[PDB]
Amino acid sequence: QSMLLKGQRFVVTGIASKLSIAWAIAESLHREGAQLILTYPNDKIKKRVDMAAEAFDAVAVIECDVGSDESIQVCFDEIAKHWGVGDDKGIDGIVHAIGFAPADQLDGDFTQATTREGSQIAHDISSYSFVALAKAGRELLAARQGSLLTLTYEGSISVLPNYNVMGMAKASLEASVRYLASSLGGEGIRVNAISAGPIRTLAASGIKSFRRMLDVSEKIAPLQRNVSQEEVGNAALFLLSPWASGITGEILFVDAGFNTVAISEKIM
Amino acid sequence: QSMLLKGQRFVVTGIASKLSIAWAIAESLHREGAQLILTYPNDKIKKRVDMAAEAFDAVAVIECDVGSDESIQVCFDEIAKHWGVGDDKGIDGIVHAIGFAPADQLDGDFTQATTREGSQIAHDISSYSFVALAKAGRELLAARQGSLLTLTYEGSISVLPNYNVMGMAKASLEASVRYLASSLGGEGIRVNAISAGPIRTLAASGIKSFRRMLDVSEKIAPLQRNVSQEEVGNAALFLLSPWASGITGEILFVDAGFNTVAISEKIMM
Amino acid sequence: QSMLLKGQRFVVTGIASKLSIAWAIAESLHREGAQLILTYPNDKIKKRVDMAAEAFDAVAVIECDVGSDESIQVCFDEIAKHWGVGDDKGIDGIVHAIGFAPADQLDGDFTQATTREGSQIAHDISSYSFVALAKAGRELLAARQGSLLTLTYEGSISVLPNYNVMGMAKASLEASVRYLASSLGGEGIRVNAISAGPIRTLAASGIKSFRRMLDVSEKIAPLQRNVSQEEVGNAALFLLSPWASGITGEILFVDAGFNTVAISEKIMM
Amino acid sequence: QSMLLKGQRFVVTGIASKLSIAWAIAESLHREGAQLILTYPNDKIKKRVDMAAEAFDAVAVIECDVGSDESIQVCFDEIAKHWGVGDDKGIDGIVHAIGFAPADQLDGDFTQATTREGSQIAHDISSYSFVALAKAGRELLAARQGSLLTLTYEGSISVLPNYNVMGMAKASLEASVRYLASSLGGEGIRVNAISAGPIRTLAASGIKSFRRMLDVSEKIAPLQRNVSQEEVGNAALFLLSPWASGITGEILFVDAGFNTVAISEKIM
Ligand SMILES: NC(=O)c1ccc[n+]([C@@H]2O[C@H](COP(=O)([O-])OP(=O)(O)OC[C@H]3O[C@@H](n4cnc5c(N)ncnc54)[C@H](O)[C@@H]3O)[C@@H](O)[C@H]2O)c1
Numbered sequence A, D: 001q002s003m004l005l006k007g008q009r010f011v012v013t014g015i016a017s018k019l020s021i022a023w024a025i026a027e028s029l030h031r032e033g034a035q036l037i038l039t040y041p042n043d044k045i046k047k048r049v050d051m052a053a054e055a056f057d058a059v060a061v062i063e064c065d066v067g068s069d070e071s072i073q074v075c076f077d078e079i080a081k082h083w084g085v086g087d088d089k090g091i092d093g094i095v096h097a098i099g100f101a102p103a104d105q106l107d108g109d110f111t112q113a114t115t116r117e118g119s120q121i122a123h124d125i126s127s128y129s130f131v132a133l134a135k136a137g138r139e140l141l142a143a144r145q146g147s148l149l150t151l152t153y154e155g156s157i158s159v160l161p162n163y164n165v166m167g168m169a170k171a172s173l174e175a176s177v178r179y180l181a182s183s184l185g186g187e188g189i190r191v192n193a194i195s196a197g198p199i200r201t202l203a204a205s206g207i208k209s210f211r212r213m214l215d216v217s218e219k220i221a222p223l224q225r226n227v228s229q230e231e232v233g234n235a236a237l238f239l240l241s242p243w244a245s246g247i248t249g250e251i252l253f254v255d256a257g258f259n260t261v262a263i264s265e266k267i268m
Numbered sequence B, C: 001q002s003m004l005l006k007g008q009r010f011v012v013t014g015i016a017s018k019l020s021i022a023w024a025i026a027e028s029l030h031r032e033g034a035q036l037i038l039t040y041p042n043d044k045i046k047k048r049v050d051m052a053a054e055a056f057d058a059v060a061v062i063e064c065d066v067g068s069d070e071s072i073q074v075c076f077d078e079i080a081k082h083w084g085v086g087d088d089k090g091i092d093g094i095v096h097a098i099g100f101a102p103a104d105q106l107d108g109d110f111t112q113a114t115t116r117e118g119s120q121i122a123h124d125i126s127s128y129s130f131v132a133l134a135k136a137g138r139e140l141l142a143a144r145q146g147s148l149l150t151l152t153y154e155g156s157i158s159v160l161p162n163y164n165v166m167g168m169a170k171a172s173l174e175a176s177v178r179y180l181a182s183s184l185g186g187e188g189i190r191v192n193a194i195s196a197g198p199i200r201t202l203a204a205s206g207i208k209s210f211r212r213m214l215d216v217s218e219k220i221a222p223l224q225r226n227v228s229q230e231e232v233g234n235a236a237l238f239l240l241s242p243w244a245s246g247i248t249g250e251i252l253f254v255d256a257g258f259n260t261v262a263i264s265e266k267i268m269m
């Protein structure tokens, strides 16, 4: 409870449950005195975004299915009504916390499991959607010299069992972080990612052997534990804050050091 | 002219002209005594693949538009007729040398220029196609314990003007190199990539400011020059050869050292 | 002026002038309500550390030449007197902001300029010193579950003119960040680095063509500018703070995005 | 047995036994028709270098303790007698296959085990020695537009138990690959490294849990096995060959894919 984001405004995608990393990012931003707009992709998920809206006193709760150009365009329309008008216009940040590939893509042998359409959807929802948000948000961001933040996973650069086409999408996503940074930096907009360690979330639960992943990680990670959503929330807060004014194009690992260790006493 | 690939067989995609990197890869494999099957995506491009078939005495010239599952499945059917059968069955390698994004994606400001469909096509043709080839060729490869090779570019990990959506696709492609390696290694199949520096090819010609890119590169690269197609051909030959038996999941830079320099003396120029 | 480091304690090396990156790190920690101990390697430099002691109300100003095991051991003795004792014992962080190689190592052609002793001194003062601080400070750090922070430069992973032996030392330093993280993590100690872009500091001033380096950087960096000491100070504050509790072994670039660009439009200039 | 290095000359350091990676590199170069000069750091090790000299018909066997400027200067003196004179002067390559840190540095907890002098020696012998060879060899290399090759290990960029200060040295070494490449490229000299997976060698045997490292690696590596010295030999041959004319500053992993996998069914 400091007051680092007093009067700052953020759009937060990807809340699905109390376990969502985006939930904790919202919580961190709210704690620090920012105002929030929260998005949801459909009615089932709206139920849970509404709970988050209540807990964080969201300014609005707007539909945003990042699969639709119409949905995104309309969503940023609504946001502009609230935050695009009058004396203090603009937004300080947009949080992209959205991943999807069809479940079959992440079940078993990579070459067997990957399909043309699976790949298409994985890249579209998990990677292009970040640039889609940047396109719709550009002017709002430029007005306040805000930043974009996405979430990635080590699966982009190292192989983790079953991660498969999501690895291809995350690698694609991370390239976009760099291209957007180069594209938007001249307007004072920063673009960054957090590479989170494994955390029990709705999506996480869906991956074969994720539980085992969680166990192994704890035994590899220098801190001898996994990270919590709160720890990613705080790191996100930093990157979204004026304190990160010199940082763009950056991938920040929040994984208890996991990415730095090839083998531990897994040996034993 | 050594004889390092005597009696070995390779499928080579991506020949579009005498300037194609894939042309030089074919040339290197042929020089070393390998047999080739060459593929073409359409009739216009067949004209030039046929010239390469003549120069390299290709075993066959088969249609392969990597945008179509049908086209790929048919293509690897044809290749199975030639190479799938008998006591000598299998292929030693498949060379993926195919990139595409709609031209508009690579024209100016990244955020402005990138579109949902542009992205879709870029990843589909430039990245997924590599796994598509691995899927169709797996059995043929396993029979000889062959390898796959693709071509990437530094645009995956560093920003280069206009490269844009192709950078996203190349990053995706490189992740697939790693996933395919993990997936196919237990069947003795290796999967690798070459990150070539900039070279004047038909696709290269089409990128705004490519000529200028070429000029700056020459002044940044430790060897004070750009690489030729032949130098990529030779490196590809190595990775496709039994000499690279211990190497998989690898990205090998053939860029005269360009990727290792942040700034050169040019500090002046 | 928030109060994020209320009642936290930090040791800050590497203040040599008002321009030092370590000066701004001290300033950020003080601004946020932390107490500081500041170190100096010799009497000439003490003059400037004393000015920083006045501005930031340092708890103490202690000698610490990281070239001497004795000097370090004595220094951490003194700091233990102040901060080692009682129900509040321990330190929240140690800031390593020390680089040195003999000037001749950084003057021109790398192979010509690098010497056995130059290399020895560069690694000893620039890299081993970080583990030296971790060894002397381990117990104090563990008591509060604090962290170590060093400063590196892209010269470790990419070539920059004249950086030379300092590039070898920084690469070594970054490996130590990882080994220390692995070694100390089980005691709840985090170990991280900031890779700062180029900034006019006393050491920076001494590098041939640094001014030119600064000019090109500004034209390559996505933000179209260089960073200030303050921006490194703020990022350092974060990594030293409880907000970075889940982050260890990390190299965080604070360079306005410079490291992510291979070539900009400058293709022209 | 092709004839790719006909009439080419290479200096090969680091032969200590038949298990030395440098042994197999010599073997690969000889097989392909190159002539070799072999070096040894002292009399004990000379016994084994002499066996290699017999097997590969070395042109000379010269002393080179890379700890001494005198020793290196004298060594390259002798080499110049053989290969620096007359019509066809120069060398096509120098193979650096030398690592050392005092044994205590690699036994147990990194922070406990590392010492000021241990670090000094590790960097001096394992990293500076590569530039020392480049300095002494520059003119011989430039005459034939030869290349330098060193050997590194993933320990530089990822943590492996006990590798410790050798990790710091290897990271330093790899930076030197890049600096030397930049420095010498204008004279047509290339500079590269191979990052070999774990292989049973004299030095390897000396590291606590190396045997376990070997076991774990086999279960992580995509090829489901470790690499042999021969496979590194062949890759070294390529990098030292005219076929690698476009390649400088490169780290080439010869590790059966190990570096690319964060976790396998170590999970199981
Ligand atoms: N260990 C981990 O859980 C972990 C680690 C690193 C990265 N990540 C990344 O974190 C981000 C958030 O995921 P999470 O782990 O908190 O899981 P989660 O299930 O809480 O969040 C995933 C979100 O994606 C949203 N989404 C899916 N398709 C959408 C669409 N078409 N339009 C809009 N939203 C859509 C879902 O509604 C959901 O809120 C993802 O990008 C994920 O890949 C997760």
Ligand SMILES: NC(=O)c1ccc[n+]([C@@H]2O[C@H](COP(=O)([O-])OP(=O)(O)OC[C@H]3O[C@@H](n4cnc5c(N)ncnc54)[C@H](O)[C@@H]3O)[C@@H](O)[C@H]2O)c1
Residues within 6 Å of the ligand: B013, B014, B015, B016, B017, B019, B020, B021, B022, B040, B041, B045, B064, B065, B066, B067, B096, B097, B098, B099, B100, B125, B151, B152, B153, B195, B196, B197, B198, B199, B200, B201, B202, B203, B204
């Ligand atoms: N500087 C460079 O030229 C450079 C640098 C590194 C990477 N590469 C990569 O090397 C590969 C070859 O490109 P190039 O420079 O030799 O140019 P090129 O124009 O010769 O090759 C591109 C090839 O892709 C083919 N292709 C496009 N869509 C296809 C489809 N649907 N089905 C089948 N083939 C299709 C074209 O027919 C053509 O042969 C590409 O992956 C490219 O991105 C090029």
Ligand SMILES: NC(=O)c1ccc[n+]([C@@H]2O[C@H](COP(=O)([O-])OP(=O)(O)OC[C@H]3O[C@@H](n4cnc5c(N)ncnc54)[C@H](O)[C@@H]3O)[C@@H](O)[C@H]2O)c1
Residues within 6 Å of the ligand: C013, C014, C015, C016, C017, C019, C020, C021, C022, C040, C041, C045, C064, C065, C066, C067, C096, C097, C098, C099, C100, C125, C151, C152, C153, C195, C196, C197, C198, C199, C200, C201, C202, C203, C204
């Ligand atoms: N552009 C930049 O300025 C830049 C970029 C990134 C990295 N860094 C790193 O940041 C750190 C601080 O450098 P700076 O640029 O602020 O310059 P500076 O000249 O202010 O700092 C270098 C410091 O090292 C100290 N030092 C040297 N030998 C010492 C010894 N034996 N014992 C104790 N202290 C000793 C000097 O007293 C001085 O305070 C260094 O590690 C430097 O390499 C600087």
Ligand SMILES: NC(=O)c1ccc[n+]([C@@H]2O[C@H](COP(=O)([O-])OP(=O)(O)OC[C@H]3O[C@@H](n4cnc5c(N)ncnc54)[C@H](O)[C@@H]3O)[C@@H](O)[C@H]2O)c1
Residues within 6 Å of the ligand: D013, D014, D015, D016, D017, D019, D020, D021, D022, D040, D041, D045, D064, D065, D066, D067, D096, D097, D098, D099, D100, D125, D151, D152, D153, D195, D196, D197, D198, D199, D200, D201, D202, D203, D204
């Ligand atoms: N798994 C592995 O064995 C492995 C993997 C990757 C990297 N490497 C690297 O391979 C290289 C060769 O080592 P190896 O594994 O074949 O072991 P090895 O014991 O066969 O070779 C090490 C060599 O270093 C030499 N050396 C040590 N100090 C010297 C000095 N002062 N002057 C000259 N020579 C000196 C020794 O005489 C010996 O020949 C080393 O650089 C090593 O770090 C080894």
Ligand SMILES: Oc1cc(Cl)ccc1Oc1ccc(Cl)cc1Cl
Residues within 6 Å of the ligand: A098, A099, A100, A101, A102, A103, A106, A152, A153, A166, A197, A198, A199, A201, A203, A204, A207
């Ligand atoms: O990327 C992730 C990485 C981890 Cl370790 C855990 C959860 C993740 O998030 C996802 C994983 C798969 C799918 Cl289909 C969608 C999402 Cl959001």
Ligand SMILES: Oc1cc(Cl)ccc1Oc1ccc(Cl)cc1Cl
Residues within 6 Å of the ligand: B098, B099, B100, B101, B102, B103, B152, B153, B166, B197, B198, B199, B203, B204, B207
């Ligand atoms: O990847 C490349 C990199 C460079 Cl430097 C030059 C050409 C390249 O190849 C392409 C670039 C754009 C498109 Cl649309 C298609 C292809 Cl094949």
Ligand SMILES: Oc1cc(Cl)ccc1Oc1ccc(Cl)cc1Cl
Residues within 6 Å of the ligand: C098, C099, C100, C101, C102, C103, C152, C153, C166, C197, C198, C199, C203, C204, C207
């Ligand atoms: O690492 C640095 C990087 C830059 Cl861009 C500028 C200054 C740096 O700091 C040093 C450079 C050389 C020496 Cl001898 C000592 C120090 Cl502190």
Ligand SMILES: Oc1cc(Cl)ccc1Oc1ccc(Cl)cc1Cl
Residues within 6 Å of the ligand: D098, D099, D100, D101, D102, D103, D106, D152, D153, D166, D197, D198, D199, D201, D203, D204, D207
């Ligand atoms: O670097 C190596 C890496 C591995 Cl996995 C195995 C052996 C290696 O080589 C050495 C390791 C330690 C020391 Cl003291 C000296 C050398 Cl030559």
Ligand SMILES: [Ca+2]
Residues within 6 Å of the ligand: A250, A251, A252, A253, C250, C251, C252, C253
């Ligand atoms: Ca980082």
Ligand SMILES: [Ca+2]
Residues within 6 Å of the ligand: B250, B251, B252, B253, D250, D251, D252, D253
């Ligand atoms: Ca490589």
